[PDB]
Amino acid sequence: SQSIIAYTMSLGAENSVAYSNNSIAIPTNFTISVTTEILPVSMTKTSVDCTMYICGDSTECSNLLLQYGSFCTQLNRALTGIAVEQDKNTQEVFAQV
Amino acid sequence: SECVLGQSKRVDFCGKGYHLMSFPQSAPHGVVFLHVTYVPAQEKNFTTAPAICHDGKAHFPREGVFVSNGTHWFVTQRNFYEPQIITTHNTFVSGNCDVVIGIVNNTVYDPLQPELDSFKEELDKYFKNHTSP
Amino acid sequence: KQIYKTPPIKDFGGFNFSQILPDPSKPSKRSPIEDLLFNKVTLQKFNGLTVLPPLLTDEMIAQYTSALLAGTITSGWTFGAGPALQIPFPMQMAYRFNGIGVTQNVLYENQKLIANQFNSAIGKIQDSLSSTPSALGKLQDVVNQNAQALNTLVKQLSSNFGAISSVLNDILSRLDPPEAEVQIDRLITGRLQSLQTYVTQQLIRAAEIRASANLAAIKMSECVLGQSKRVDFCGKGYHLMSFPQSAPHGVVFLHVTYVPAQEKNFTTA
Amino acid sequence: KIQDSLSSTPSALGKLQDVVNQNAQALNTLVKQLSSNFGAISSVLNDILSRLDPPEAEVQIDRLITGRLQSLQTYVTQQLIRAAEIRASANLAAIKM
Amino acid sequence: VVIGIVNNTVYDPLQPELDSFKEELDKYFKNHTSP
Ligand SMILES: *[C@@H]1O[C@H](CO)[C@@H](O[C@@H]2O[C@H](CO)[C@@H](O[C@H]3O[C@H](CO)[C@@H](O)[C@H](O)[C@@H]3O)[C@H](O)[C@H]2NC(C)=O)[C@H](O)[C@H]1NC(C)=O
Ligand SMILES: *[C@@H]1O[C@H](CO)[C@@H](O[C@@H]2O[C@H](CO)[C@@H](O[C@H]3O[C@H](CO)[C@@H](O)[C@H](O)[C@@H]3O)[C@H](O)[C@H]2NC(C)=O)[C@H](O)[C@H]1NC(C)=O
Ligand SMILES: *[C@@H]1O[C@H](CO)[C@@H](O[C@@H]2O[C@H](CO)[C@@H](O[C@H]3O[C@H](CO)[C@@H](O)[C@H](O)[C@@H]3O)[C@H](O)[C@H]2NC(C)=O)[C@H](O)[C@H]1NC(C)=O
Ligand SMILES: *[C@@H]1O[C@H](CO)[C@@H](O[C@@H]2O[C@H](CO)[C@@H](O[C@H]3O[C@H](CO)[C@@H](O)[C@H](O)[C@@H]3O)[C@H](O)[C@H]2NC(C)=O)[C@H](O)[C@H]1NC(C)=O
Ligand SMILES: *[C@@H]1O[C@H](CO[C@@H]2O[C@@H](C)[C@@H](O)[C@@H](O)[C@@H]2O)[C@@H](O[C@@H]2O[C@H](CO)[C@@H](O)[C@H](O)[C@H]2NC(C)=O)[C@H](O)[C@H]1NC(C)=O
Ligand SMILES: *[C@@H]1O[C@H](CO[C@@H]2O[C@@H](C)[C@@H](O)[C@@H](O)[C@@H]2O)[C@@H](O[C@@H]2O[C@H](CO)[C@@H](O)[C@H](O)[C@H]2NC(C)=O)[C@H](O)[C@H]1NC(C)=O
Ligand SMILES: *[C@@H]1O[C@H](CO)[C@@H](O)[C@H](O)[C@H]1NC(C)=O
Ligand SMILES: *[C@@H]1O[C@H](CO)[C@@H](O)[C@H](O)[C@H]1NC(C)=O
Ligand SMILES: *[C@@H]1O[C@H](CO)[C@@H](O)[C@H](O)[C@H]1NC(C)=O
Ligand SMILES: *[C@@H]1O[C@H](CO)[C@@H](O)[C@H](O)[C@H]1NC(C)=O
């Protein structure tokens, strides 16, 4: 009795309003409601050893890697910057008192 | 900063509706807010007028809007029904009644008027008593 | 979440909204200024480059914007915060003046003049949009950037990348299964690098498009659904209200602002 | 007091000093990258041009071309990201003003 | 303590309302001395 159907999506429940030039509506009762909200603040720190990953424990591969300049230094610096930024974020969001 | 440490007038920023206050809560790699908001619930239709002309002058509400149920006119807050007698402190006078489009006839009461009328009656009674001796 | 519908009567105390409220005669509920907007903006498949259609169609977007406009002009700011409550327009505008710190008798003393100025201003912006084309650069530019990136991505297939020929069938037809491998590696590496470059640029562009959509969301919520006290946020000067209008891949606001004009010197204490 | 405080410590203006230093460091590494072999037999194109016959000379140049092109792409991408954060701070400054 | 204060009279809306009543009371007294 269950099947896949297809239909034009409904924008919402239609609601006409009664405009006039001399009538107002003033509320007589109210409700207090509480609603939640969720925001990410930071992500897990992570550092990767460039030479270890690319040339694990091998001197020959280390020597061949030494030709490619400062790529490993660049990667290490970038990941260190991200790692510091995370603690900066937590400090800013929580340490207000 | 703008929700917990104070009250924010920004619309739909600190929760949907009329904001009152908030509570932070911790969570893994994040934060959760519990917005507390005020929402009007039950409404009723009424009859209104933009201004009131009593002594040939237009009166306008200092705070509130003119409202009537069909027989008498009162002032009420914007977001909550609370009728009150039309008095001088509620209204301020400016200009004449011709330029106001849609002005509606009615009397305007003065809270000083009955306080003075009580003294006038006391004075009249004292004057009448003064002829007795 | 509810689509408020405009009343058939157009008695707003002299204010005229015909140029912003949708016209039923057109097959789509598109207002006249909206039509000018879509007319100004001038809005691969064989190689696997495909384009997808958006979820929200242009008619539904028009329905949303019309519902917003009707809710505003009928109920002020209440429809964004609770149950919608009707109120006369000649009272809503006096509420706005009380908001900006000018007492309400000004409207009741100057209604006709203010209505005439408001209508003249709408006519002026109508003419300005129908005349100048440099206004819609902020959308024509994003369209052009996307087209240019895709065009270069297509064009990249013509280069040798160090091989002997840029056509995959030619090399495969002239060379056997053995030596063809050398030429096939260079082509793969070059085209893969091209794809990586295109994808990275798309990632950055999409992030900025999102930042603009978030700014637009805050402007909508804080200008249309209420009155904002922020300085030079909802238009230059003292703010009163706003009106959203749809456009290709964007949105256009018509901020309505109050500006003092004729000053005089006095002596104070 | 504010004038005295600004005239005393240098740790306050780190926000602008870092904006200068990151650009200087990145461009400095970009210059340094011209000294690496990238798998070739020499880091000087003139030498590879002067030595070898026309055919092989170009082949060694290609290794150099690939490496230097990769370096340029890395530098350009980092500049694009940095510019976005500078513009985000510029929008915040405009709103505060 | 305020710098630059400027001399001027300050008016009362209650003052004429009581002044009219005082004049009416004086006229009523004068009338009451007539019979
Ligand atoms: C519209 O609102 C008016 C004010 O709220 C209201 O007038 C009030 O009516 C009540 C009766 O419901 C009166 O209360 C008095 O009624 C009798 C009259 O003899 C007395 O015996 C009672 O003890 C009580 O005092 C109020 O005095 C009267 N107030 C005013 C200012 O008129 C109207 O009835 C309302 N009309 C509708 C249609 O809702
Ligand atoms: C609310 O009370 C007002 C005060 O009386 C009242 O205004 C009065 O309106 C009548 C009707 O027009 C005027 O009567 C005069 O009308 C014309 C002038 O156009 C003359 O030709 C007539 O002979 C007659 O003099 C009153 O003069 C006028 N009173 C005042 C003080 O201005 C309103 O009409 C009342 N509200 C409603 C809805 O009727
Ligand atoms: C609200 O503003 C509208 C926009 O200006 C306006 O519509 C305009 O009305 C005029 C006059 O009716 C039209 O001008 C044409 O009118 C007739 C039509 O047959 C011709 O005989 C005239 O010579 C002239 O060509 C405008 O074309 C029309 N514009 C639009 C966009 O519809 C409304 O009349 C205004 N309404 C109120 C209540 O103020
Ligand atoms: C506005 O009214 C004020 C009230 O009268 C008036 O203040 C008066 O100023 C004069 C001028 O100084 C004083 O006169 C006394 O001045 C010195 C005191 O420092 C004495 O040596 C003099 O002999 C003289 O007594 C008045 O005493 C003073 N009034 C009061 C009640 O203290 C202002 O001057 C008026 N505004 C202007 C612009 O004149
Ligand atoms: C407030 O009024 C609206 C409509 O105005 C009414 O019109 C007459 C019927 C008369 O009663 C006036 O005094 C009213 O002000 C009401 O909306 C209507 O609601 C009914 C059922 O509730 C519905 O059948 C109608 O279709 C509605 N009207 C329209 C135009 O859609 C509204 O309910 C009134 N508010 C309250 C609290 O009663
Ligand atoms: C307001 O006044 C200024 C000048 O102050 C005036 O000084 C006296 C002459 C006396 O009239 C005071 O009550 C005034 O307040 C005007 O500024 C001048 O404007 C003229 C041109 O209109 C210009 O040539 C002068 O250079 C201006 N003054 C200066 C110092 O630059 C100002 O225009 C007046 N405002 C209005 C609305 O009239
Ligand atoms: C309201 O509109 C009606 C017609 O729809 C008109 O007769 C009446 O005078 C108007 N009232 C006001 C206050 O504008
Ligand atoms: C009238 O005045 C006399 C004083 O002269 C006083 O004793 C008496 O109580 C007064 N009567 C009334 C009714 O006030
Ligand atoms: C304004 O300045 C003048 C001198 O330029 C001085 O004489 C006067 O007292 C001052 N007034 C105020 C209220 O500061
Ligand atoms: C004076 O008082 C008498 C009371 O007998 C009254 O009839 C008369 O009208 C009064 N006169 C005035 C001018 O008030």
Tokens of C186: 């260079």
- Tell me the nearest-neighbour CA distance from D33 into chain A, angstroms: 6
Q: Please, are residues B34 and B23 in contact by the beta-carbon 8 Å criterion?
A: yes
Q: DSSP alpha helices (H): ranges in C100-179?
A: 105-131, 137-155, 168-174
Answer whether C3 sits within 8 Å of A12, measured CB to CB: yes
Q: Measured between CB atoms, does C269 come within 8 Å of chain E?
A: yes
Closest ligand (CA of C9): 7
The experimental resolution of this structure, in angstroms, equals 3.6
Nearest to B74 by CA among B39, B49, B96, B101: B49
Compute the distance between CA of residue B92 and CA of residue B62 in angstroms, rounded to an integer. 6
Paired with C246 in beta bridges are: C251
The rounded distance, in Å, linking the Cα atoms of C92 and C90 is 6
Which residue puts its alpha carbon closest to atom 6 of ligand 5? Answer: A18
Distance from the Cα of E17 to chain C's closest Cα (Å) equals: 26
**Does E6 lie at the interface with C, CB-CB under 8 angstroms?**
yes
Helix (H, G, I), strand (E, B) or coil at D59: helix
Distance from the CA of C112 to the center of ligand 4, in angstroms? 52
Map chain B to HEC letters. Answer: CCCCCCCCCCCCCCCCCEEEECCEEEECCEEEEEEEEEEEEEEEEEEECCCEECCCEEEEECCCEEEECCCCEEEECCCCCCCCCCCCCCEEEEEECCCCCCCEECCCCCCHHHHHHHHHHHHHHHHHHHCCC
The three-point CA angle E14-E17-E23 to 5° equals 135
What value does the CA radius of gyration of chain C take, rounded to a whole number of Å?
27
Q: Which ligand 6 atom is nearest residue C264's CA?
A: 37
What is the experimental method? cryo-EM
Q: Which of A50, A70, A79, A82 to mutate to test the interface with D (most CBs of D within 10 A)?
A: A70
**Helix (H) / strand (E) containing E17:** helix E14-32
Our CA angle for C16, C86, C24, nearest 5°, is 45
For A88, C53, C96, C152, E27, the CA distances from B44, given in Å and listed in that order, are 52, 45, 23, 63, 53
Other beta carbons within 10 Å of B60 = 20
Distance separating alpha carbons of residues C115 and B52, to the nearest angstrom: 22
Which two structure tokens, joined as six digits, stand for A65?
């890697």
Neighbouring CB atoms inside 10 A of C225's CB total 20
